[PDB]
Every structure is written in C-alpha cells, then in structure tokens.
Amino acid sequence: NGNKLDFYGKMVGEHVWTTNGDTSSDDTTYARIGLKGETQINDQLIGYGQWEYNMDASNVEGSQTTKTRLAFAGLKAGEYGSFDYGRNYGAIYDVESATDMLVEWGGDGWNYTDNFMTGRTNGVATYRNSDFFGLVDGLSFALQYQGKNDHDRSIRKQNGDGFSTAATYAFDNGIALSAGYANSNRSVDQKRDGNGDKAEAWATSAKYDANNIYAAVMYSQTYNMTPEEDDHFAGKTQNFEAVVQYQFDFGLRPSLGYVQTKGKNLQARGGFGGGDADLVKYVELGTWYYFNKNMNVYAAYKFNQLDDNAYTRAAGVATDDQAAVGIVYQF
Amino acid sequence: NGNKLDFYGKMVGEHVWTTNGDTSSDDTTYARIGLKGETQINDQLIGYGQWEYNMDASNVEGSQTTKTRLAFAGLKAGEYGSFDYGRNYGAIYDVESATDMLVEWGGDGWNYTDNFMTGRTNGVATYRNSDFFGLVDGLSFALQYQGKNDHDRSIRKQNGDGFSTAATYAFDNGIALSAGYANSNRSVDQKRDGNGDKAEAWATSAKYDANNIYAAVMYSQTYNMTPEEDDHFAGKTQNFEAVVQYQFDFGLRPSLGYVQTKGKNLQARGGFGGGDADLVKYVELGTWYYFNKNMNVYAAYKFNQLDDNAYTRAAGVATDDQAAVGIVYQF
C-alpha cells in the first residue's frame, strides 16, 4: 500500500457554428479519460505516471480518431525537483497556460500540438523544481530537452534536437510573473525552405488571480517555429494574448479574451505579394455556468477580426465568426 | 460525495460462420468498456454523462478499429424530464428496442448506425420524459433533433437537419405498446439521386414480457431513409420483425426471431431491371445459457431466406445462412 491511482475524465457534448460567409454547423462531441499514478518509494522519493486519452465521438463509427495526448513517467525528490519523460506539454507552454483559460478557443496562435515545444509533443525529458531548491518561495522553473522527430510526419510537425525553459515567480497576494525561451534545430526537411537552420521563441506572461477575478496577459515572439495554414513557417511572429474573467459564487463565470498573432517577413505565394500579415486576430466573449465540480455548461462567440485580403486568400485562413455551446460531465 | 461512477463492459469471445455457398469462417471477438456518471446538483436537478467504447480484437494488431458508440451529457429535472446531447441512440430506435433482443442478429433491416436516427448517430439533442410530466403512469416519450452531417462522410452515412419522436405506453400486467416517427432533410449530396428531398419513417411495436415469456412484434415503413448494400437508398421500405423467447429457471433461454425488409420502387442497376425486392429476410433460431449476471454462453443459426435473383446479384446482398457461437464476461 504505497500507491495512489486516480481516474479522471469528461464527456463533452459540444457544437460549433461558423456564422459569417462560409457558414457551417458541426458536432464536436468527444470523451476524455486519463489516469494519474503516484507511488511512495521513499520518504525522500516519489515515482509517478500519467496518461490521457481523447476519443472523438464526432465522426461516424468507422472513422473517429483517438489521440494519446499525455503519456509520461517520472521521479520526484523533494527540493531536488522532479524529472519526467514521454509525451508532455513543452516547458514554454507554462508561460502560455495563464492565457489559455478561454471557453472554446485560446492558444490558437503560436501554440500548436506537435510543434517543437509550443504545446504537447513527443520525446520530452523535462526537469522541474518548485521553490528553487528550497531557497526562494514561489519561484518555480522547468528545463526541458526534446530529441529529433524527423521522418514519419509531415514537415509541419517535425523538429530537430532542441531545448526549452520556463520560470514562474508567484507572489503571495495573487500576482504571478512568468517567462520562458526555446531554441531548436530544424529538421533536414524543414531547412529546404531556406528560412534558416534554427527555430526559436521567447515568451513572457503575467496573471492576477484573486478575489474571484482572473486577468492574464501574454506576449511572445517566434522565429521559424510557427506554422501557417499554408504549411510554410512564419519566419517571425509577434503574439499577444489577454484574458479577463470573473467568478460569481453561484456558478457563473463570464470571460473576455483577446488573441492576436502578426506574421513578419512572410514569403510570397499566389495572390500574396508582400510579407506582413495577421495570422490570427479574434475576440472571444463567452461564459461558463458551473453547477458543481462534476457538471457544467458553456457558450462562447468568436469575433474573427481577420479581413479577406491577399494573405488570407493565398494561405487559406478562415476569416469568419464562430459560436460554440456545450455541456460537460466531468469526474 | 454527491456523485456516482459506474464502469460497465464486456469481453466477448465470438465466432461466426457462413455455412452455404460462399462459405467463410471468421473471428469477431471484441471488448467493450463504458462509463456512466450521475451527479446530484440539488434536490430538483441531476447531471449525467455516458461514454461507451468498443474495441475490435478481431483483426491483427495494427488494423483493429475502435469505436466510440455513445458519448453524451445531460441534465435531468424530476418530472420536467431530461435533456442530453451528443452521440446517442436515435429516438425512433425506442420502437425497435423491443424486437432487437436476438442472440446474434436483430435490427439489421431498417436500423443502421449513422443512418439519420434509426440507430446510434452524431449530434442529437434528445428530450425524454417518463410518466408524461407526472400525469400518466407508464407513458414515456422522447423528442429529438439532429443537426446536419453533410461533408466528411460517405453519402450513405449523411443526413440533413431533422427530428424524431417516440412514445411508449407500458401496462402493469406486462404488455407495452410503442410508436414513433421521424422526418429529416436529406443532404445536398443525397438529393442527386432524384429520389426526393426528405427522408421519413414511422414505426409501431408491441411487446409482452411476463411469466418467463418474451414476445415482441414490430412494423415500420421508411422513405428515402434505408440504405441498400449498393449505397442507393430505398425509396420505400416495409419492415416487419418479431421475436419469441422463453426463460427456463436453470439458465437456458431459447429464442426464435423473424426479420424482413421489403424494398418498394427500387432503382434499376446492373442485372436488376424492376423495382420490388426483399432486402432482408431471415429467421434466427438461437439460445443463451446464463451462468449468472456476469457470465453467459450463446449460439445461434440464421436461416437466410433471400433468393439468388436479379436484385441480390446487382446490389451484392448475401443470400447465405450463418451461424454464431460466443462466450461473454460481463460487468
């Protein structure tokens, strides 16, 4: 009896509309199940593992994709910190997690899954340490290495060897500052574009979280990291996200969110001559109603502020507004 | 602890033969796991969720399909009724459930998965209410809306916007009557047939269930709803199913089942000139042996009464008899 196992998951009945121009109306129901395991090895040492499995319930029974989102195991040793390996969130995502607190959208621009260390990815060894080796209360950090994923994927989702690091200072009153950087080799396949051999990003964030108020802001820049809808990589991006939300005691939680991603020095193709354009720009207005920890409902509206222009037409980016409603059983 | 979670599932070791003509002999082993969640939100209101996951164990490792059969969440508010949304059984299936109580086959004709609301489908908002708002004991009903699924599927599995409704009256002595109707728009892709722009069905059923006897009968008609093996839709269908079973005290439960589906005004193709033909016609003779709630074994034989004729050859329908044995662990 030195072990703890914890099933968690959710059934999410959800539906999304596109309300302007290229209108559409789609089911996006899914279920998620995960497991969290923690074993007491010593008085000084803990071993742990996590997996998280997503199940599309949205396509017909022949064709529903499943995804293993997380899968890792690690040791954890008091103030010496922790170390895990497997499929995990990239460390620079710690910066973003403040502003990825939206109802339906959020972390669209700049953070993609299987995109170096901007979101969830394969083959990450991660070292963490909260309270800076016991020396500084509230200062945590993350160092992380990623091996190359170079052959059995689209060029869009490849990476060379690389690393990523994030620090977060959290003050007693409710503020937390947070900053992170990542540098990676690009894959031999990626380098054929002539855009450069390295891929980098840095990110900064602040959040306030006290008295039922939640506000967060986040700024970053990426270089040869962020993929466009075209499958070309943005040579330079400037990303800004921001969120404010309030929590009523009775379950209601309205939310206002802003998300922008400016591409700089973008390559020419088709109708798009130049090299400066918004990739993502939208406001999310939405709300949750929490009945209790186990049950909630939500709704949200995305005001998509991208224009129909030379870039959006050539790169095939959607300029239209969207809406989403959903109901969630949780455990 | 105002929450309840309930794992259910089964391992099903099963094997099926085709015994006439085009003989064959195939494994059809699978496992199924599901989860049922119910939270007490207050005295008046309950929240719930269900997910059900099927795992083919029948193909080689590398080619086994998984299916999320059910995934939904809903609220439930006493005699005001319940409301769920996600991937669920279509409401007109309530009519059929009486006669889909066979050993191996059953609900072949007329009910297909991802076929408007005849079986399990995507994007269904369903309202239910048992005992007709507290006014009529034993009278339950279901109203249900389905949004369009019109792009990322075969034409066979598409649907337009539509609705479906079922009522069931159940008497104290053991009889239950049941009736239901559905009307749907067809998809732009489906309408290329020239068959018509709407898809409809109605269904009626009765069952008797007392003194170790189980009998059920069911009649329906569908219009532009029921897919043929050819991927053409039957313009008009007349379906009749019937079942009788008896439960011996010692665990044995023999079953006799009849299932027929007549196509009317069928389009011509290949060898098939005319437009009148049986799509399904078979007798199932089979039995279960229940060891206890958790374990049973079963066997069944399908006498396939379709002839080798112009229709069956052109549409590629199987005319051959089948047999099936299986063992089930259940929880």
Added chain:
Amino acid sequence: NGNKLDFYGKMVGEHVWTTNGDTSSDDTTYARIGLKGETQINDQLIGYGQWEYNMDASNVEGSQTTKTRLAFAGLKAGEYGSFDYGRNYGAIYDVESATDMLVEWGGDGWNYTDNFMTGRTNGVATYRNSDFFGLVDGLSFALQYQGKNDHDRSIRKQNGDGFSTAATYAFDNGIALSAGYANSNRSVDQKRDGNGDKAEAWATSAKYDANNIYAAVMYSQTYNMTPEEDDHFAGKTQNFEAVVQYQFDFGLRPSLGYVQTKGKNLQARGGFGGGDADLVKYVELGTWYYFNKNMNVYAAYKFNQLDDNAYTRAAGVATDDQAAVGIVYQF
C-alpha cells in the same frame, strides 16, 4: 457480490537508438491498460475475462495506433481445468515465455504477433490445466485450436485452421522444463509460394529461477511458419535463445541475452543465390533498476551480429546495433 475487477497497466517513457550505419533516434513511449474479471458462478466453477489495450504515444496526435493485444473470456472449473476463447497468446508461446524475459528485445526470432500461434493471435480456443487433473504437482499443459484467418490481412499474417499444445513440468527446487508443438494449415494465399501446404513448429525450454538467479534456455525449429523481412516464409528454421539475469538486493538486475534464428533452404531472390542464412542473431546486454514493484528504470544495448551479406541485402534485414533507455510506472 461474487465478482472481482482488477485494473492493471503501465506508462512507459522509452527511447531507442540505432547506433551503426543507418543511424536513427526515436521515441517509443506508450501506455497500456488492462482489465481482469473473475466471477464466482458456484463452488466448483469460475467465469473470467481479460482485455489488454496498448496506446502508442509516439507518433503525432493525428497518427498514433492503438492495439487490443488480449481479449478473451472463459470458464475455469478447479482441477477439470480452464477454457477460454478470443485473442490470446498461442500455447507454444508457453515454451518461449521462459526466454522472453529481456529488457527491450527478446522473442524477435521465431515469435511474431499474428503469426499462426507463435505469439498473440486471433480466434484461439485454449484449454489449460495445471497440476494434471490434480494428479501430478507442477505439471501443467495447454491444448489450443485456431480457426482460419484467410482474407482481410497481408499474406504475412494469415493462417489456416490449426492447433498447438504445450506442457511444462516445474520442480519445487526452482527448475522448470517445458516443451510444445504446433501444426497448422496454411492459407490458400500462402500456398501460392509452392513451399508446402502445412506449417509446423516444435519447441523445448528449460529455466532455473531461485536465489536471485534467473537462467533460461530455449531451442526450436519451425517449418513454413516463420516470416522473413522479405514476406517470404522460411521453409525451415532453427532457433536458439538463452538468458541469464541476477537480482541484487539493492534493486539492480543485470541481464545477458542471446537470440539466434538460422534459416535453412531459403528461396533465391535478388543478390541472394543460395539457401542458408541467419535471420536474427544478437546479444542483449541490459539492466533494470527496480525502485519498487510500481516503478523502475532500465537500459539495454543490442549487439546485432548479422553480417552485411547477399541475404541481408536481398531480404532487407537490418544488421545494425541498437540501444534503449526507459522509465516505467506500473500498477
């Protein structure tokens, strides 16, 4: 009441290098979850089921395969023995299990998944009995039948009707002897090679397992059973495997493993004229470090002793060394 359910599984963070010639460096993280169900039917009789599900966490979220490795249900009646059906280990694998105790590799030569009854396969009815009907302590056996899998697979993974049997005698001091045989029809598709209509193997093994020492040895021969990397079948093979390991009190457990598979009378193709060649030949040197039952780490190195020669070039067999490290949470 008279039912028992048992979740087991593991998260495995793991990474593999190819260190010679065609170098590579790949993540091979996965999670596994399984369930073991046992119901008491009466004093004399037990019903059971098992399912085991593997989840690749190694590819990108679009493309991760899952596998149902085991899925069966059976009855068990004291000394009368047990009987299960579904997807299970083939009975002749009982012989191999002694020598498939390596860190990363092991049971490469001769045992393939979905290869008659050499590993995990579909449609196996298996009868088992330990202690030979209560008469001989430590003598167990397995008889097993497999139906044909003949149409919706690669020729490599097909089988005709067949059977397989294994016996194991285990002495109280720590030795166990073990022997087994299998005969199968080949599929109509397999027989096109002209190699013969039947597929057979026999296998013998011994193991010692006491006083922190583990040694095992294993010899077999197969005929028209074992697939080459070319998708031709080896008309005759001679397989030898051997393993020694020691368990230190501190958690460390080094392992030395040897695995060879000689092909005899191999068909000519490409550069390869003759008909005698090694298919598999390697030494594994590796170690575990067990923190406790729930958590371990390991590393291993595969010295691949196959030469670059006429066979390896024509059949496309990899001659290169490999290495592997990993961490495991287990329950």
